[PDB]
Amino acid sequence: SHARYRPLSLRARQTLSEKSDDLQYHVVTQEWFGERVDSFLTCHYPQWDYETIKRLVQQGHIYRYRKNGKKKFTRLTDRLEFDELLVVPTRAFWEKQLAPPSGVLEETDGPKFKLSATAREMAHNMVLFKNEHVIVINKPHGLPMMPTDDPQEMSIAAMLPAWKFTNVAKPVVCHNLDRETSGCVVLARTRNAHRMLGRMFVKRVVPNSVYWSFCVGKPTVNYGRVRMHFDITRGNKGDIIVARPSPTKTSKVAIAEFVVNASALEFGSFISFYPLTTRRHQERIMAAHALRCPVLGDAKYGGDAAFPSSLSLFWDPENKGLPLHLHHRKIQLPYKNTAGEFICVTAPLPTQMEKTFKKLGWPCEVDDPLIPG
């Protein structure tokens, strides 16, 4: 259950490797003298994948001893020397407080979810961009990205087995969105593709995505930067988020560059957010409190203020159930097209956002030049 693993520094990991006797010493005899390490290990462990062997050797869990009084860490391409030992951890070595790499232990799928015909049809409809390595879908409003506390609710994590068109394994979501946020979601089709794309969703210095939002009221500045420090504390049935202007040790920063594209006079504004971090409800909080303009329909931050009576001709401010006017518009990818530009996937505006734009007279489908291709 992996519940017995503990955080270990390099010193503690080396000490545990020295203490634990759960090791096998393969003697390099004349028949295997001169072979490569990866070849030897692949011939001696048929149950291990090459990825598992590579991770073990490159992280140093498998090493070799040349009768010098010290352990020798090598690459997969190094040759074996005569009359040396190859030290490999056994199964019992990983039962202590030292977690192995992902390939060592064996996971069990167990249950397999069943998707209906209509579910698969809508999953295929939500596809925006498909590639040999990535699939960008258009997640709508109100659909959870992951199974919530109520297991009876549908989710993209449950619809995932519908996007394995020709692969054997289902894709893996690279980044999660809020239940109300709608827009482009990235799913890596390959394990290596996921490992390479995970780098793209950590805190960065240059933004690679856009968020189009309709906020209630126009801020005092057309463009600028927003920087807050969020501290998350566990509450009764929720999370208490404390926003600070100064950093704390238990806090994490949230940074985003905002630009007010168009707006009403002082009653509504259309704003493009370009984030550099990944914090919970980042755009909504930075709009409600930093810009002092709550997103239209954001009942969690500025509830009564998120349903203005100025748009009563268009949206009835009494139902308080209109979708959140925040949309993950455009996202850049590391893959290039035939023209030599990075592929930028764009999602069309939702029904409520298109309706608001048409009522205010703004063009809905416009390319955002601030994120190049």
Next chain:
Amino acid sequence: DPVFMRNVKRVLASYKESMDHSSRKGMSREAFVDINEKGAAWYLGH
């Protein structure tokens, strides 16, 4: 200048803005800001 009325006129001429009413702010600070040992902070949640 027997009575300090220049200061009265100066302080009365500066009435352009009231601290109780905001003209272009949809969100309020008096509903979310509170000072702690580290400084001021916004507390989001019921």
